[PDB]
Amino acid sequence: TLQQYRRASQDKRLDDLVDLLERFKPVLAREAIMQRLTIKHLEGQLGVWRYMD
Amino acid sequence: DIMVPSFVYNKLPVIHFLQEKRAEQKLRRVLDETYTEWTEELDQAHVTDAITRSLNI
Amino acid sequence: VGNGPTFSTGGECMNTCDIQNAFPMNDRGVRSSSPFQEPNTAIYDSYLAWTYFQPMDVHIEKLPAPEAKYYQRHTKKPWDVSSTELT
Amino acid sequence: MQGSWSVLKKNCSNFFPGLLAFAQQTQEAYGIWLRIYNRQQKYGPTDFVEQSETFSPDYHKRFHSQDKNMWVDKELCTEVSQKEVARLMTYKLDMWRMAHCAGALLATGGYAIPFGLFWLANDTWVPSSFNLTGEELRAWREAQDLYRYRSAPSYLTDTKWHFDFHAYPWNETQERAWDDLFEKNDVRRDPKVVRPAAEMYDGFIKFELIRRKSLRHLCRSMNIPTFPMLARLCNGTRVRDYWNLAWCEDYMVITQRLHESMTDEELYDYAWRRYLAPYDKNLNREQLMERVEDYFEFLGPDFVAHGKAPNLVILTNYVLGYYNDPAYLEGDISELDKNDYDHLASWGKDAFLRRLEFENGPLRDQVEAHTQRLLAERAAIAK
Amino acid sequence: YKGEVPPHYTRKSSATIEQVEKEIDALLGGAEKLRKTSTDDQPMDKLTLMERCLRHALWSYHKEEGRYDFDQIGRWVVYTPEDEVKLAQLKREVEAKEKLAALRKR
Numbered sequence: 001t002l003q004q005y006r007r008a009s010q011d012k013r014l015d016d017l018v019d020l021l022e023r024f025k026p027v028l029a030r031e032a033i034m035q036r037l038t039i040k041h042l043e044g045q046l047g048v049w050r051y052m053d
Numbered sequence: 054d055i056m057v058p059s060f061v062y063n064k065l066p067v068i069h070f071l072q073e074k075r076a077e078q079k080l081r082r083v084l085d086e087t088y089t090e091w092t093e094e095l096d097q098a099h100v101t102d103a104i105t106r107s108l109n110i
Numbered sequence: 111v112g113n114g115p116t117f118s119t120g121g122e123c124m125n126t127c128d129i130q131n132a133f134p135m136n137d138r139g140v141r142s143s144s145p146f147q148e149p150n151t152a153i154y155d156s157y158l159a160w161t162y163f164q165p166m167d168v169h170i171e172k173l174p175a176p177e178a179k180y181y182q183r184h185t186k187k188p189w190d191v192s193s194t195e196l197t
Numbered sequence: 198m199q200g201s202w203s204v205l206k207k208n209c210s211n212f213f214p215g216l217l218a219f220a221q222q223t224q225e226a227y228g229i230w231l232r233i234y235n236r237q238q239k240y241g242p243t244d245f246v247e248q249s250e251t252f253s254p255d256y257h258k259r260f261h262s263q264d265k266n267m268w269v270d271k272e273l274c275t276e277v278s279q280k281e282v283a284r285l286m287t288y289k290l291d292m293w294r295m296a297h298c299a300g301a302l303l304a305t306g307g308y309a310i311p312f313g314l315f316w317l318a319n320d321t322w323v324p325s326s327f328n329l330t331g332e333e334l335r336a337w338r339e340a341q342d343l344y345r346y347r348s349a350p351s352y353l354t355d356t357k358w359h360f361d362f363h364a365y366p367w368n369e370t371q372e373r374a375w376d377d378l379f380e381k382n383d384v385r386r387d388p389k390v391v392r393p394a395a396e397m398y399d400g401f402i403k404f405e406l407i408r409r410k411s412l413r414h415l416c417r418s419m420n421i422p423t424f425p426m427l428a429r430l431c432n433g434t435r436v437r438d439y440w441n442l443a444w445c446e447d448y449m450v451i452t453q454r455l456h457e458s459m460t461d462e463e464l465y466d467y468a469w470r471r472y473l474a475p476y477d478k479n480l481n482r483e484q485l486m487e488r489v490e491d492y493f494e495f496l497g498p499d500f501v502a503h504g505k506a507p508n509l510v511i512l513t514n515y516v517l518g519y520y521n522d523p524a525y526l527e528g529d530i531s532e533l534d535k536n537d538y539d540h541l542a543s544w545g546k547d548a549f550l551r552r553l554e555f556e557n558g559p560l561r562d563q564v565e566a567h568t569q570r571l572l573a574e575r576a577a578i579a580k
Numbered sequence: 581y582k583g584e585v586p587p588h589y590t591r592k593s594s595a596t597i598e599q600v601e602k603e604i605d606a607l608l609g610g611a612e613k614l615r616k617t618s619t620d621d622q623p624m625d626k627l628t629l630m631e632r633c634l635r636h637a638l639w640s641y642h643k644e645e646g647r648y649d650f651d652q653i654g655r656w657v658v659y660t661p662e663d664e665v666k667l668a669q670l671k672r673e674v675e676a677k678e679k680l681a682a683l684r685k686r
């Protein structure tokens with residue numbers, strides 16, 4: 001009986017968690033990209049065109 | 054070839070800084086609006102009391 | 111280390127410019143010449159002061175490569191020309 | 198979209214049938230507009246009918262006022278249906294483009310023929326009637342959407358940059374609304390959060406003060422021909438008329454809940470005429486309904502209560518935000534492992550570069566200490 | 581007491597709780613080297629914020645479902661004094677029921 005009552009909400013929470021994970025992944029991708037750009041910048045092999053792209 | 058490129062180059066840092074701040078703001082909002090919801094469920098003592106009454110005790 | 115150039119500065123000192131806040135400050139108190147973080151930024155004093163960043167060999171913890179789905183945006187249009195192609 | 202020979206053949210083949218269909222649509226739309234204009238003149242407010250003058254406070258230049266020179270006919274459903282209004286809007290667009298082309302023809306005589314060849318080779322400025330099949334119509338809609346993508350970001354950036362450079366929001370809610378208004382279409386914007394931007398910009402710039410360049414960008418984004426642009430009060434009138442018709446239709450639909458009963462293709466067209474749903478996104482009914490409901494929510498209760506829509510500039514920015522796609526990024530991340538200045542390696546470092554590396558390299562602290570100690574010793578010796 | 585059973589809601593996507601937890605662990609495992617040490621009063625990092633949000637949601641779902649791990653729930657879901665009080669209330673109840681069932685069986 002309790003499971004039937006707490007059914008819509010648990011599914012909504014799971015979906016929200018999945019959406020949150022999918023939302024956070026791009027942020028980490030951008031962070032990795034910035035790390036690589038910084039690495040190349042410190043080596044003096046980064047062009048502004050690459051940075052803008 | 055010369056002017057617009059130079060002014061774009063001058064723009065780049067400020068825009069990068071502002072967009073970084075905006076992203077930080079949005080993640081900050083993500084965590085701010087999260088709260089732990091403690092649910093309340095009917096106490097079983099009342100259930101036991103109703104069971105006793107049904108017995109005619 | 112190589113002899114390549116870095117992010118252009120225009121001969122400006124970032125510790126006194128009108129957009130100085132956009133340039134990160136390091137431990138020594140010298141604002142970077144670029145939006146990136148620079149540990150060895152310096153200032154040279156000719157008739158006017160100017161900031162300089164010397165490239166060096168430094169190791170940075172590299173986050174693993176993400177999937178193409180989460181950073182590629184296939185919104186290219188026929189009129190679009192990338193900065194590399196333009197260069 | 199660029200011109201092509203296939204589109205040229207398509208438009209040449211369907212030229213005369215297209216003209217005939219355009220003439221029939223012209224007759225029908227003239228009837229519809231006659232009904233609407235009679236109703237406006239009879240039941241319209243005194244200011245709207247008399248064309249009250251609203252002048253700018255700086256240069257005293259007249260322009261259409263959203264409150265006074267725009268009127269929502271709440272009782273138009275009795276005389277004119279929603280489908281007739283949509284037909285009139287589509288015909289207005291087609292007639293505008295055809296009128297510009299005809300004006301060019303009359304002005305230049307027979308020298309416009311090669312320019313006509315350039316015109317028929319692209320679907321950007323041809324009427325919808327030139328498409329006699331579904332595939333042709335799809336290509337035409339694709340061309341219109343491409344033009345909208347090309348034009349909208351400039352308008353959005355103009356608005357945002359001018360406001361942010363010359364003004365700032367008053368309160369935090371206005372700040373959030375302003376920041377979220379210009380987000381890319383890949384994220385969903387909450388109309389309730391974004392609405393206060395309308396009042397803020399009313400405090401900054403109303404529709405009556407819209408600049409001519411911003412108007413040109415907007416008309417580009419609305420597939421409205423801009424050459425010859427002329428004074429800003431002509432295309433401004435076109436925009437006012439189009440959005441007045443759109444608001445009348447929106448009130449009709451909201452009151453009668455027609456969109457729920459509206460079919461999929463008609464719903465897609467209704468959203469498209471509001472610049473909410475590109476055809477290249479392949480949206481389903483759920484997404485279209487979500488966008489339409491968001492648009493109605495952005496209009497707000499006051500729209501139904503009194504027929505007063507929010508600031509038209511902010512409304513146009515909001516709706517056109519769906520054509521502001523995320524900036525393209527193509528190429529594997531491995532490309533970031535390359536180097537850009539290998540061609541300089543052969544040059545090496547000169548004396549000044551070697552000095553800079555020595556002074557600002559890993560030995561920088563030692564060099565600084567040695568130099569400062571030497572300078573202090575020399576200064577002490579001098580004294 | 582509760583009310584009418586809430587209207588059925590279709591999931592927007594199909595995924596198991598175990599799969600979500602595994603995905604979260606994989607996401608947070610690659611940034612362990614980058615992840616940084618901070619005090620309670622210091623400002624937090626992106627990795628720390630993501631970890632806190634994800635773990636909070638995960639353990640809230642587990643608590644509602646009934647997989648009560650009081651240590652993990654305490655660490656990741658308990659941020660406010662009132663919430664801590666409620667956790668203490670829950671901890672006593674579960675132990676009391678377990679003891680009651682055992683002795684009722686004995």
Ligand SMILES: CCCCCCCCCCCCCCCCCC(=O)OC[C@H](COP(=O)([O-])OCC(O)COP(=O)([O-])OC[C@@H](COC(=O)CCCCCCCCCCCCCCCCC)OC(=O)CCCCCCCCCCCCCCCCC)OC(=O)CCCCCCCCCCCCCCCCC
Nearest residue numbers: 250251252253257258259260425426427428429430431434
């Ligand atoms: C190959 C062809 C070559 C063509 C050459 C001819 C020129 C070009 C032709 C046309 C080109 C196309 C584009 C034209 C501009 C479009 C402007 C526009 O968008 O208007 C929208 C606008 C529509 O908007 P709206 O909301 O309906 O109304 C406007 C609002 O009121 C707006 O509200 P507002 O708040 O802005 O209100 C202000 C508004 C109010 O005005 C209006 O908008 C109302 C309309 C204009 C009224 C103008 C008449 C005013 C009274 C004149 C009285 C003269 C008395 C003299 C008596 C003499 C007795 C001896 O503006 C004014 O106040 C301006 C007043 C005019 C001032 C003129 C000053 C001139 C100074 C001269 C200096 C010296 C010159 C040299 C020396 C000469 C002497 C020796 O259109 C109009 O209002 C009328 C447009 C008329 C267009 C021009 C028609 C051209 C006809 C040409 C015929 C001859 C051809 C010859 C060919 C020769 C062989 C090739």
Ligand SMILES: CCCCCCCCCCCCCCCCCC(=O)OC[C@H](COP(=O)([O-])OCC(O)COP(=O)([O-])OC[C@@H](COC(=O)CCCCCCCCCCCCCCCCC)OC(=O)CCCCCCCCCCCCCCCCC)OC(=O)CCCCCCCCCCCCCCCCC
Nearest residue numbers: 223226227230292293295296297299300303304425434435
């Ligand atoms: C042979 C001599 C030639 C002379 C040289 C000409 C040189 C070329 C210049 C351009 C000439 C016109 C070209 C044809 C345009 C098509 C007709 C038209 O007006 O379309 C409506 C449409 C109205 O636009 P709108 O923005 O919606 O109007 C706002 C009003 O509130 C709208 O009011 P509403 O909101 O109440 O709604 C009313 C609407 C409601 O109606 C509807 O909804 C039903 C549809 C009605 C319009 C249908 C138009 C169809 C257009 C396509 C036609 C087929 C083309 C086929 C091409 C292929 C052929 C093989 O009905 C209207 O559109 C009526 C507008 C007012 C009538 C305008 C016509 C006046 C001139 C004709 C009379 C001349 C009498 C001469 C007497 C001589 C005495 C000595 O016209 C336009 O799109 C404007 C023209 C765009 C190009 C402008 C180019 C610059 C013009 C500068 C002129 C300056 C003065 C002249 C000197 C120039 C020297 C440089």
Ligand SMILES: CCCCCCCCCCCCCCCCCC(=O)OC[C@H](COP(=O)([O-])OCC(O)COP(=O)([O-])OC[C@@H](COC(=O)CCCCCCCCCCCCCCCCC)OC(=O)CCCCCCCCCCCCCCCCC)OC(=O)CCCCCCCCCCCCCCCCC
Nearest residue numbers: 198199200298299301302309310312313314315316319322
């Ligand atoms: C049968 C048909 C049905 C009946 C007819 C119906 C009516 C038809 C007519 C109406 C049609 C209207 C719609 C037209 C749409 C298409 C327009 C267009 O052209 O689109 C661009 C069109 C391509 O369009 P698209 O690819 O579809 O892209 C469209 C996009 O949406 C891109 O769009 P977008 O918006 O980015 O592009 C716009 C772009 C449009 O512009 C362009 O795209 C430029 C086009 C030309 C580029 C040329 C590049 C190549 C140059 C080569 C140079 C020579 C090389 C060496 C040759 C050696 C030969 C031996 O910019 C503009 O709009 C600027 C407008 C400028 C207006 C100028 C006004 C001046 C007024 C003067 C001041 C007056 C003030 C008042 C004074 C008052 C005084 C009283 O361009 C071309 O196709 C280029 C053609 C190049 C031809 C070859 C080079 C020239 C050959 C000249 C031969 C001369 C022979 C005689 C010599 C005699 C010597 C003595």
Ligand SMILES: CCCCCCCCCCCCCCCCCC(=O)OC[C@H](COP(=O)([O-])OCC(O)COP(=O)([O-])OC[C@@H](COC(=O)CCCCCCCCCCCCCCCCC)OC(=O)CCCCCCCCCCCCCCCCC)OC(=O)CCCCCCCCCCCCCCCCC
Nearest residue numbers: 297298300301304305308322413417422423424425426427
């Ligand atoms: C590196 C070197 C390379 C080479 C460089 C070459 C050398 C260049 C040096 C100088 C360059 C700068 C010159 C600037 C001059 C001053 C301009 C100025 O003051 O403009 C004010 C102002 C600025 O224009 P706007 O309306 O604000 O916006 C302009 C934007 O570009 C609008 O842009 P939008 O994005 O807003 O709209 C885009 C789109 C929007 O789409 C639409 O609007 C739909 C399509 C519209 C179609 C056109 C409708 C026209 C309606 C009637 C217009 C009034 C007619 C008046 C009576 C006729 C007068 C002749 O519009 C278009 O795509 C327009 C297509 C036009 C294609 C033609 C462009 C010129 C190419 C060359 C062809 C002619 C060559 C002659 C010489 C050679 C002979 C052998 O101009 C006007 O008000 C326009 C009035 C137009 C009157 C008609 C033209 C008068 C000039 C004489 C024409 C002679 C024809 C000869 C025929 C052949 C005889 C053999």
Ligand SMILES: CCCCCCCCCCCCCCCCCC(=O)OC[C@H](COP(=O)([O-])OCC(O)COP(=O)([O-])OC[C@@H](COC(=O)CCCCCCCCCCCCCCCCC)OC(=O)CCCCCCCCCCCCCCCCC)OC(=O)CCCCCCCCCCCCCCCCC
Nearest residue numbers: 256258259260407408409410411425426427428429430431
């Ligand atoms: C290859 C080259 C070949 C040779 C080329 C030769 C070149 C000659 C050089 C000299 C030309 C000087 C004039 C340049 C005009 C362009 C200016 C411009 O675009 O400025 C941008 C300017 C900047 O705007 P914005 O900064 O974006 O915004 C500021 C405001 O917010 C804007 O807000 P707004 O739009 O509300 O406010 C403006 C509006 C506000 O007012 C209104 O809305 C009310 C409109 C009132 C109209 C009154 C008309 C009165 C006419 C009386 C006629 C009576 C009948 C007489 C009949 C018998 C005699 C013929 O007032 C006006 O702009 C209209 C003023 C009166 C227009 C008169 C007609 C044009 C005369 C052109 C010739 C001038 C003398 C040239 C010789 C001397 C040169 C030093 O925008 C405008 O002014 C927009 C309107 C532009 C309309 C004029 C152009 C129309 C197209 C001409 C068609 C004919 C083509 C002929 C080709 C010939 C080839 C050889």
Ligand SMILES: CCCCCCCCCCCCO[C@@H]1O[C@H](CO)[C@@H](O[C@H]2O[C@H](CO)[C@@H](O)[C@H](O)[C@H]2O)[C@H](O)[C@H]1O
Nearest residue numbers: 227230231232233234235236237238239240241246247
């Ligand atoms: C070359 C020129 C080309 C012009 C092209 C455009 C032509 C447009 C023609 C429109 C004709 C409309 O017809 C006209 O409508 C108005 C408004 O309903 C009517 O107006 C009538 O009712 C209104 C409203 O109660 C009264 O204010 C008015 O006193 C009365 O006459 C006119 O009696 C009728 O003649």
